[PDB]
Ligand binder design. Structure first.
Ligand SMILES: *[C@@H]1O[C@H](CO)[C@@H](O[C@@H]2O[C@H](CO)[C@@H](O)[C@H](O)[C@H]2NC(C)=O)[C@H](O[C@@H]2O[C@@H](C)[C@@H](O)[C@@H](O)[C@@H]2O)[C@H]1NC(C)=O
Ligand SMILES: *[C@@H]1O[C@H](CO)[C@@H](O[C@@H]2O[C@H](CO)[C@@H](O)[C@H](O)[C@H]2NC(C)=O)[C@H](O[C@@H]2O[C@@H](C)[C@@H](O)[C@@H](O)[C@@H]2O)[C@H]1NC(C)=O
Ligand SMILES: *[C@@H]1O[C@H](CO)[C@@H](O[C@@H]2O[C@H](CO)[C@@H](O)[C@H](O)[C@H]2NC(C)=O)[C@H](O[C@@H]2O[C@@H](C)[C@@H](O)[C@@H](O)[C@@H]2O)[C@H]1NC(C)=O
Ligand SMILES: *[C@@H]1O[C@H](CO)[C@@H](O[C@@H]2O[C@H](CO)[C@@H](O)[C@H](O)[C@H]2NC(C)=O)[C@H](O[C@@H]2O[C@@H](C)[C@@H](O)[C@@H](O)[C@@H]2O)[C@H]1NC(C)=O
Ligand SMILES: *[C@@H]1O[C@H](CO)[C@@H](O[C@@H]2O[C@H](CO)[C@@H](O)[C@H](O)[C@H]2NC(C)=O)[C@H](O)[C@H]1NC(C)=O
Ligand SMILES: *[C@H]1O[C@H](CO)[C@@H](O)[C@H](O[C@@H]2O[C@@H](C)[C@@H](O)[C@@H](O)[C@@H]2O)[C@H]1NC(C)=O
Lengths: 639, 642
């Protein structure tokens, strides 16, 4: 977060920040605790706490009722699930204090206060701050070293909603269970019913189809993108050749004019014995061929105590990890050829590598290969995930007394700020943005706010955003509407709104037993005479069975769009491959603010493979562009 | 130097700094392995224009061009003819004033480094770095090259510096085992002195044996090295709550928390690689090392064995001068070492936690004379007490070339840095030189000798506890042969009241009394004086030494010293005497009255007997004021001279 808000174009001059006061008057809850004494959680520029708030600072182990402030305004923890499970347990950290790190990291990403002069062992240096630097923090810890319990999770969410939180951020997910057994979904439904939007991670079991979790209609489901940041061990050869490779070695290693060797017998870097046969290992650099297992090469290299290693690799796994315990660089295939060449055509080939360099990459963003993919096996009906946000190697606060990274085989390091990857990092970005949107428009519903963020998202990086796993254009099942564009989201022109009743009607059309229905609903609605699955959503999915012959299919979607800008819009269409689409009316006229207008989209398609297209309502006498993606998809095994 | 000027009490409010403008109008030359110009210490952010007086060049060379200078680094010159003449076949890789070693960059920043924000030695000693004289001008003269260092090049560098009109000279080099007329630094220094330029030189690091110093010449400011009050911590906490502030300089934020500790006499020696290789799960276990007089070997065996960490029991002063700490660990004293071992023996599942990158400014006592700081008396010239003065020289933080080996982690990882910790009289001298330079800026007419006088008679012989400064090698009171007059006290030195002055002619007369052949005489004096009808060894010096042969029977001896003291303050002083053990001293007159630059002479007389170097002093304390002019006295055997 020393760059992330810049990457999002956020700034004090104009856009969401000024409009929202950096979220000072809004409150975002974060469902493993927090390390309160971190700089990210101090309150230097914070105005008084809004009267509305009455949340507690619940005492516990190494945590007392004065631990809160105008920034970290609430702290609560929920451990009854653990105890009920086994009253024999001694909970070491019986409070909201974080002993894992995940909770601290997420909290600072979403609403970390400005923190000067931080870095990840020299990388990504600068001032850290949350996407919403003045948003209020309410911590709810349900994850403990001794266990994490579904019911505790739900108890935490319910307490947060009950506390009057403006937004909820949760970087957890469960798979393989139907909605009426899905903890986060059950609680989210409740949150939505009460006007609180929930941001949750899509999960990290990508890139296989339908691999995401938290894919519920009443949740903002967030996928993870790379930013334009990179970390360098600049590689210079004895012949002047200079290459900006990749490195995250956590110290200013000194490797200058050292002997480089390339030996096919060991070039694999998979044999400890072989590597142990290179003389003067401590002053020599070895080249490692691409063998699809970098982290094993790094381990063998680290164990053998080589000066450094040059790794040839383009495996996306490499660029999401901060594990770099031994000096070395990673280079792509072409570059790897240049290097090997230099070595073979020389006696006395040498190399120099420097570290702790950080640069601000094309193209970006890119969908992380491991970001889980739609459609939702919780509910195929509605396209997921919703939106893309930065989640690869993000810098945020961290507990000073836990393992952070490693040097050599025997040295562990700790830190105040660490780089971390995952949809876990992305979600809190969205949550903060959502919170600022809500501060700018205090009347906007959870659904409208998700709408602003979506129809305003950018699907381009100026080409279509790529999927890192295959290098082809990302789908809405990869990135939803696209990369969050906070500033635009401030002024979307049209929003696809929805009400609590609308979700009840949706839940109702699912045809669960009334007991299952009650499980999810539980006390926000009763068993519901107007079932309706066509929930007013800012995106479109068209599904097709794969059980037998494929035949031309057709689908019709009804949408209502309210004007938040008098204005008129013309629909522009781009039909998914091998399909046709049509809308009606083709034009929407608006007399004045708040007026609502409906339309119907119709797709005619055939299955076999997920094709994409879209529909944009572009303003004729203005610069508003309301975009909604469209995707066809097979009908897959649901939970 | 993130603390060092604070340790010396220097500040912008009052004292030497304001009085001198932090040395902005003065110039100090560093006879060097050169310099790394692009360092933050050598930028010119607060620097006024370069004084017109200066006409020194920015001599081009390898990777160094004529624009490499600025209002801070105002001069750069190098001298390599000695190398070439010795062998024209040589290819000098860095043929310029650019530093490829580091020593020169370190010394330069210590003496006149500009304020540099947010620096540290891998997390230790963090803060703003600055020279003892943050606005002094730098003139670099490089005579030391990777391919060689030549006496004649050294002399050529000094002469060029004097010729350039430098105000002060700093040189952290020394040679031993040679008579004055073969002593390069002395020869050149005589020339510098003759022309009103004081030379600060290190006393050397072959202490603590007697007469081990170099640069012990009457016309040189000979500087010894002290510890400061700074310490570096791996706080050690045991599983039983016991918390110990041990010593550590591991160059990263290692994470060692609640780890298993073992104490096993069979390997507690930490000298067997094989033995240590027998401890299972070495990567998660902490081993205790007994005191065996060779810590650095223990550290090597531990590092090679890849233990989580080690707890070293040691009080060896060698440990506290080194930044070599490639593996997590702590060093504890003997008592603490007992507590730890106890805890371990009386427990199953003993554990420990160590944290790093902690730095404290609380140490008592300080300063302390470094065990390795070379000791008087001068085998160059027993006649005059050496060294002259004490200054911070142990683990000093200063600039360093970014592209050279700095320190180490594990057996295979080398690190580099912009600012490094370094120990030795090498670090002390540039401290004195900067102070001398500021004194000269405050009093533009003061001679080199007067300035050395101000620094000496104003030096403090007591430590932060108000006891007499200790010798780290034995823990007894330091001698003037260990620390000269004592620890520099810049602010006081600004207003000494009385100075023991001297003139170029005075040194000629001294040189003359040495009775060298006239060729030898010419070697040293070369062209500043001619072969000298008023020989005189009683050089007007701010200290006293009384020598006694050890060749046979010891018999009551007597010595008389004549001193002249000029008043730099109308005032009157009464002499207070403290006679060295087993001896008597007397002065006359016992009182000095001053009407208004007036000069007044007196004679000190010691009656002593040899056997062992005893110390005493003579202080001229002002009756109607707060001036105190102190001069140490020391008896000494007469040892083999060079
Ligand atoms: C949870 O903490 C308890 C203390 O609050 C532990 O029992 C206390 O444990 C002491 C440590 O062995 C023991 O000296 C005390 O007699 C005992 N007394 C009480 C009432 O706390 C408990 O440890 C378990 O129960 C104790 C009594 C022993 O039987 C241990 O062997 C058990 O592990 C702690 N529970 C756990 C699972 O750690
Ligand atoms: C390339 O790969 C191997 C790295 O271990 C080297 O072979 C090994 O050489 C060792 C002595 O250098 C020897 O003890 C090992 O038995 C041997 N291992 C194997 C699998 O052969 C090889 O060195 C070359 O080949 C060996 C056999 C000797 O003939 C050496 O003199 C050769 O340099 C490494 N280097 C090269 C240039 O192939
Ligand atoms: C001193 O620098 C010279 C020029 O850079 C070196 O001579 C040159 O070395 C090159 C590499 O061997 C070679 O391509 C050039 O033809 C050669 N000659 C000239 C005029 O440049 C010189 O290297 C030494 O002398 C050469 C001729 C070889 O015999 C080497 O063995 C020598 O090292 C450098 N001298 C040294 C001591 O490095
Ligand atoms: C203290 O150190 C001894 C030397 O390392 C340990 O003995 C060594 O134990 C190894 C297995 O632990 C074994 O492979 C080595 O051959 C043996 N070496 C020597 C010189 O004794 C000893 O460990 C104890 O005694 C040994 C023989 C085994 O029986 C272990 O199980 C014992 O712990 C050391 N004793 C310590 C921890 O108590
Ligand atoms: C003298 O050395 C300086 C130091 O670089 C040269 O200036 C640099 O030139 C490079 C071009 O290769 C630039 O990238 C650096 O930023 C320049 N820095 C500046 C502002 O000096 C300078 O050009 C050299 N002059 C000559 C005549 O060689
Ligand atoms: C709890 O918070 C911190 C963390 O332990 C404690 O240091 C506080 O100690 C007590 O309050 C502070 C303000 C100080 O006066 C100290 O001396 C007290 O013991 C504690 N704070 C409170 C409000 O209990």
């Amino acid at each position: 977060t020393t760059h992330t808000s810049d990457f999002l174009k956020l700034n004090p001059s104009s856009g969401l920040w000024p409009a929202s006061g950096l979220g000072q008057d809004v409150i975002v809850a974060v469902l493993s605790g927090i390390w309160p004494e971190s700089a990210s959680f101090q309150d230097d520029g914070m105005p008084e706490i809004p009267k509305r708030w009455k949340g507690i600072c619940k005492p516990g182990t190494q945590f007392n009722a004065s631990m809160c402030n105008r920034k970290l305004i609430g702290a609560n923890y929920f451990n009854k699930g653990i105890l009920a499970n086994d009253p024999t347990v001694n909970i070491t950290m019986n409070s909201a204090r974080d002993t894992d790190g995940h909770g601290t990291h997420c909290a600072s990403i979403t609403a970390g206060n400005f923190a000067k002069g931080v870095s990840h062992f020299g990388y990504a240096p600068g001032t850290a701050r949350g996407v919403a630097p003045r948003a209020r923090l309410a911590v709810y810890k349900f994850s403990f070293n001794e266990g994490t319990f579904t019911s505790d999770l739900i108890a935490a969410m319910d307490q947060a909603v009950a506390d009057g939180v403006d937004m909820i951020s949760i970087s957890y997910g469960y798979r393989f269970i139907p909605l009426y057994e899905d903890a986060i979904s059950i609680a989210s439904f409740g949150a939505m019913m009460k006007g609180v939007l929930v941001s949750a991670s899509a999960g990290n079991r990508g890139p296989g189809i339908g691999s995401l979790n938290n894919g519920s209609p009443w949740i903002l489901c967030v996928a993870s993108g790379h930013t334009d940041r990179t970390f360098a061990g600049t590689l210079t050869l004895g012949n002047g050749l200079k290459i900006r490779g990749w490195s995250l070695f956590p110290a200013r290693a000194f490797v200058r004019d050292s002997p480089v060797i390339y030996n096919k017998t060991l070039s694999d870097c998979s044999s400890e014995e072989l590597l142990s046969q290179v003389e003067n290992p401590e002053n020599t650099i070895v080249i490692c061929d691409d063998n699809g297992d970098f982290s094993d090469q790094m381990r063998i290299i680290t164990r053998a105590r080589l000066k450094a290693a040059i790794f040839i690799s383009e495996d996306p796994g490499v660029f999401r990890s901060a594990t770099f315990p031994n000096p070395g660089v990673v280079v792509n295939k072409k570059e790897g050829k240049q290097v090997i060449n230099y070595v073979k055509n020389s006696v006395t080939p040498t190399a120099t590598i420097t570290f702790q360099e950080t640069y601000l990459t094309k193209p970006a963003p890119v969908v992380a290969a491991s970001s889980a993919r739609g459609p939702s096996r919780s509910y195929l009906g509605i396209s997921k995930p919703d939106i893309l946000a930065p989640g690869v190697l993000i810098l945020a606060a961290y507990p000073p007394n836990v393992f952070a990274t490693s040097i050599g085989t025997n040295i562990l390091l700790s830190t105040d700020y660490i780089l971390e990857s995952g949809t876990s990092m992305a979600a809190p970005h969205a949550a903060g943005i959502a919170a600022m949107l809500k501060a700018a428009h205090p009347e906007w519903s959870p659904s409208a706010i998700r709408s602003a963020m979506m129809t305003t998202a950018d699907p381009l990086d100026r080409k279509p955003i790529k999927d890192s796993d295959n290098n082809k254009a990302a789908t809405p099942l990869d990135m939803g509407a696209g990369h969050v564009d906070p500033n635009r989201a401030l002024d979307p022109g049209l929003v696809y709104d929805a009400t609590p009743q609308d979700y009840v009607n949706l839940l109702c059309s699912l045809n669960f037993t009334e007991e299952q229905f009650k499980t999810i609903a539980r006390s926000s609605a009763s068993h519901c005479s107007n079932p309706s699955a066509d929930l007013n959503y800012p995106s479109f999915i068209a599904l097709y069975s794969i059980e037998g012959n494929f035949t031309l299919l057709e689908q019709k979607f009804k949408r209502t769009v309210t004007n938040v800008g008098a204005a008129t819009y013309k629909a522009k269409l781009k039909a998914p491959k091998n399909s046709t689409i049509s809308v009606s009316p083709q034009i929407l006229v608006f007399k004045n603010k708040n007026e609502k207008q409906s339309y119907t989209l119709t797709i005619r398609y055939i299955g076999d493979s997920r094709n994409v297209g879209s529909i944009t309502w572009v303003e004729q006498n203005g610069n508003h562009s309301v975009r909604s993606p469209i995707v066809t998809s097979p009908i897959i095994e649901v939970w």
